[PDB]
Amino acid sequence: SNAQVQLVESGGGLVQPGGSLRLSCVASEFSRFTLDYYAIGWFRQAPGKEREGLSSISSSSDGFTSYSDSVKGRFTISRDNAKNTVYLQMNSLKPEDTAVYYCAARLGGWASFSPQEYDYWGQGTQVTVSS
Amino acid sequence: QYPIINFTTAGATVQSYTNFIRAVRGRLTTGADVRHEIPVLPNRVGLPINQRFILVELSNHAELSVTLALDVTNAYVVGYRAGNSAYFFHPDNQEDAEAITHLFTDVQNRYTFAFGGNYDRLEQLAGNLRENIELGNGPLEEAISALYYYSTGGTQLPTLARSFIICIQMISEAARFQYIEGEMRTRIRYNRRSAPDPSVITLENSWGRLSTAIQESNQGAFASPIQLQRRNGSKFSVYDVSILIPIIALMVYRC
Ligand SMILES: [Cl-]
Ligand SMILES: [Cl-]
Ligand SMILES: [Cl-]
Ligand SMILES: [Cl-]
Ligand SMILES: [Cl-]
Numbered sequence: 001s002n003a004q005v006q007l008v009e010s011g012g013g014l015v016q017p018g019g020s021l022r023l024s025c026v027a028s029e030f031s032r033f034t035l036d037y038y039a040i041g042w043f044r045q046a047p048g049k050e051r052e053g054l055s056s057i058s059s060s061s062d063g064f065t066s067y068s069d070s071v072k073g074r075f076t077i078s079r080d081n082a083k084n085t086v087y088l089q090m091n092s093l094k095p096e097d098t099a100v101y102y103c104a105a106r107l108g109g110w111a112s113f114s115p116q117e118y119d120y121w122g123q124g125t126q127v128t129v130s131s
Numbered sequence: 132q133y134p135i136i137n138f139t140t141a142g143a144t145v146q147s148y149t150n151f152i153r154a155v156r157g158r159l160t161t162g163a164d165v166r167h168e169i170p171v172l173p174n175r176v177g178l179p180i181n182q183r184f185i186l187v188e189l190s191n192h193a194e195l196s197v198t199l200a201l202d203v204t205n206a207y208v209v210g211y212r213a214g215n216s217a218y219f220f221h222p223d224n225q226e227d228a229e230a231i232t233h234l235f236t237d238v239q240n241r242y243t244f245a246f247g248g249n250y251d252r253l254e255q256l257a258g259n260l261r262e263n264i265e266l267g268n269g270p271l272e273e274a275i276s277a278l279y280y281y282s283t284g285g286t287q288l289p290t291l292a293r294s295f296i297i298c299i300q301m302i303s304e305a306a307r308f309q310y311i312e313g314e315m316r317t318r319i320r321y322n323r324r325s326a327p328d329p330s331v332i333t334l335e336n337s338w339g340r341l342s343t344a345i346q347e348s349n350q351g352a353f354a355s356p357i358q359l360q361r362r363n364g365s366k367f368s369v370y371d372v373s374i375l376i377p378i379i380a381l382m383v384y385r386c
Contacts, residue, residue: 002194037193059193059276060269062322106285108193110273114287117280 003107005031005038005120012101012125019093019129025086025103025122035079039109040086041118042077044099044127051102053113055088059106066111095129133184133200133234134158140272141192145316148268155306156380158185159203166346166382167372174384175204180233184209187302191272195279199298200234205383206303208248208295209234216240216282220248240282248295250335256292261300261332266315267324270297300327304335310378311335329360334378342382345372 006028015021023042027035041056055077056066065077076089090097102125104118112118136158138151160170173182185203190196197213209231210219217235221244222228231243246252254260264270274294280286286294305312314331318324327335337357344353348371356368369375 033193058269058273060272061192062267062269062324064269064324106276106280108191108195108272108276108279110277110290112287112290114290116287117285117290119285 002032003119005033005035005105005107007040007103007105007120007122009101009103009122009125012127014128014130015093016131017093017095017129020089020091021093021127023088023090023101023103023125025088025105027084027105029084033107034081035084035086035105036081038105038107039111039118040077041104041112042075042088043102043104043115044097045102045124046099049099051115053115056111056113057086058111059108060110064111066113068113090127093127093129098127098129100124101127133181133186135186135188135198137188137190139190139192140268140275141190143268143319145320148316148319149312152302152305152312155185155187155201155302159201159206159306160381167348167351168376169345169372169379169382171346171382171384172204172206178204180230183230184234189271189275189298191275193276195276197275197278198235199302200231201303206306206381208299208303210243210248211278212238213279213282216242218281219243221246223247248299250296250299253292253296253299256288257296258289259293261296261335262326262328264293264296265324265326266297266300267318268322270324271301274298300331300335304338307338307381308334308378309380312380328362329364330362333359338379339383341369341375341379343385344369345375345379345382346385348372 008026011023039059042054043051045051054068054071055075057077058064074091078087103122105120106118136154164171184200187199197211199211200209212235217238219231274297277286277290277294344357351372353370356370358368
């Protein structure tokens with residue numbers, strides 16, 4: 001069952017406009033491949049909206065990253081390999097950003113904004129920006 | 132069957148890639164048929180099927196593999212196999228059609244795309260020009276994956292076109308041109324991806340017309356100048372096979 005992996009996101013919650021949140025994709029132990037072998041994307045979904053891509057990181061060893069126009073200069077996707085983890089750091093949060101955020105992964109994948117191009121998904125987390 | 136040259140992007144080095152490319156050249160022209168010092172590809176005409184193709188097996192650190200099929204006459208990619216399935220660019224004609232049927236004979240799933248594998252088509256489909264598509268070890272790594280997953284539905288069309296444009300230039304165009312081989316090396320050396328500048332693209336576009344100007348030259352003098360661009364897009368002309376000795380490594384057969 002190569003490439004089988006479980007992803008547990010966290011780090012979501014409520015924040016005042018102009019705040020900062022750090023999400024987390026943690027890959028559960030005993031996946032045959034570790035997370036550094038994976039591309040991970042980050043999406044957000046409003047109740048009406050379909051899933052929309054925001055930030056991404058390739059399985060490529062050069063650490064190539066993609067950011068949607070909406071989040072540029074705000075969101076930063078990164079890695080901690082010894083923790084088998086991928087962070088997403090959201091700064092200067094605006095209420096527009098309120099949504100359910102998901103992380104998704106593909107073994108040997110590329111940085112993509114397409115949900116079809118990832119395989120394994122996180123359970124999702126709510127982000128809320130208000131005062 | 133057809134000969135296979137293996138390559139992996141995992142711990143790829145400059146020598147790794149250089150050895151692989153030389154390897155591929157060796158398999159294309161074994162004849163030492165040479166004109167004006169530039170080796171020439173085999174002539175399409177009366178070529179026994181057995182000598183028509185060569186396979187390039189590609190794999191990445193994630194252990195995903197595909198095998199490209201290159202045409203020994205043009206050096207160009209005609210399609211690939213991954214695991215259970217195999218796909219082909221649209222044949223230009225009946226002849227090239229019959230030919231492909233000898234590739235990947237064992238494959239359970241056979242498909243021939245409706246479109247061709249020429250840049251015009253692939254750039255259309257990718258939603259980007261070669262100018263805006265980066266090349267490097269990383270880009271190639273992703274291209275392998277993107278081909279593997281296509282068989283299973285996990286690859287979007289534009290991503291496929293994009294992935295082809297990466298392979299064609301990193302393999303075929305690199306075989307055809309020491310110069311392009313070179314540009315790829317720099318990218319690999321630094322594990323730094325970048326799209327090709329005009330000096331590269333105006334070459335890729337001009338291989339046919341250069342193959343001709345050479346093979347039909349007078350004692351090496353081009354009958355008419357072939358125009359190319361520099362990095363900054365400034366136009367310049369080529370009047371002689373001499374300046375290209377170090378540039379182009381292969382030509383399609385002519386005359
Ligand atoms: Cl098709
Ligand atoms: Cl089809
Ligand atoms: Cl076409
Ligand atoms: Cl058309
Ligand atoms: Cl286009």
